[PDB]
Write a protein that binds this ligand. Structure first.
Ligand SMILES: C[C@H](O)[C@H](O)C1=Nc2c(nc(N)[nH]c2=O)NC1
Ligand SMILES: [Fe+3]
Length: 290
């Protein structure tokens, strides 16, 4: 039978809180595990997401000096690499978001503002989420041009901590490209193809999403550059991917979907997409076979 899937944007209310990883619960190994203040703050952000319902303006938060400084360091360091490492489509959009949404070393952009900016640009919107959802639920959000986004900030003790993703990853890694029409269309189609799809189908779509939206590379003027959100928000993997150390292959769904998605370590191989339009076309051909 066909598993339950949202039929309208408000139906996301029925899966947005199905958090399987991260969230308010911090493990003993977490940088802020022994920080009482941080623990309560994470519960706060988690509650804002759990209580959120479609149609609500996303609760705005007055970030602390510590959170702003942590964001500043992450933003400062990554921005030093973008000019020479990021794909032109990213470089064209980050400045846009920054101007209209307040991306500054001393100011964390509010999700509601980013959501409204995206709504007018590509129809994409943001929904705050406590933690990571299942691939099926997260992808179902894309079908309605909704990107579930974390709102909390990594612990200040280690601004370069990536094991657990946070709002910096969302704002710097995922958001800019959602302002690009072709990228937004590509993302929505992955979501639409996943609705009510089989487990095997969702797994394959999730993998293609992983090697494009999350860790995709482009080749511009013969130079390898990154567009994957996981690369754009990670200093270490950002450099690793563009070094001759990593294996690189052309994006090809039938093959790319066979690749295992790694966590904790660098990917065994990164895939290069010719353009967002071409990646979209390749996925159309692929989905017709699954
Ligand atoms: C998209 C792919 O399925 C990936 O494994 C997932 N990413 C995310 C997720 N959930 C959230 N909130 N954010 C993500 O980026 N669930 C699953
Ligand atoms: Fe991500």
């Amino acid at each position: 039978s066909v598993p339950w899937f949202p039929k309208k944007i408000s139906d996301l209310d029925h899966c947005a809180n199905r958090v399987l990883m991260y969230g308010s619960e911090l493990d003993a190994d977490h940088p802020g595990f022994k920080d009482n203040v941080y623990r309560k703050r994470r519960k706060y952000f988690a509650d804002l997401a759990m209580n959120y319902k479609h149609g609500d303006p996303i609760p705005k938060v007055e970030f602390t000096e510590e959170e702003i400084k942590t964001w500043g360091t992450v933003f400062r360091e990554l921005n030093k690499l973008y000019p020479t490492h990021a794909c032109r489509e990213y470089l064209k959009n980050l400045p846009l978001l920054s101007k209209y949404c307040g991306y500054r070393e001393d100011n964390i952009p509010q999700l509601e503002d980013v959501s409204n900016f995206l709504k007018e640009r590509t129809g994409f919107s943001i929904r705050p989420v406590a933690g990571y959802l299942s691939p099926r639920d997260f992808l179902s959000g894309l079908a309605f041009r909704v990107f579930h986004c974390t709102q909390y900030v990594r612990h200040s003790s280690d601004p370069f901590y990536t094991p657990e993703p946070d709002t910096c990853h969302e704002l710097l890694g995922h958001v800019p490209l959602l302002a690009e029409p072709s990228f937004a269309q590509f993302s929505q189609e992955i979501g639409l193809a996943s609705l009510g799809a089989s487990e095997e189908a969702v797994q394959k779509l999730a993998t293609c999403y992983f090697f494009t939206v999350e860790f995709g590379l482009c080749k511009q003027d013969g130079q390898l550059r990154v567009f994957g959100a996981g690369l754009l928000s990670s200093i270490s993997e950002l450099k690793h991917a563009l070094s001759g150390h990593a294996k690189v292959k052309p994006f090809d769904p039938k093959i790319t979907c066979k690749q295992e998605c790694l966590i904790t370590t660098f990917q065994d191989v990164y895939f290069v997409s010719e353009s967002f339009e071409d990646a979209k076309e390749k996925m159309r051909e692929f989905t017709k076979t699954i």
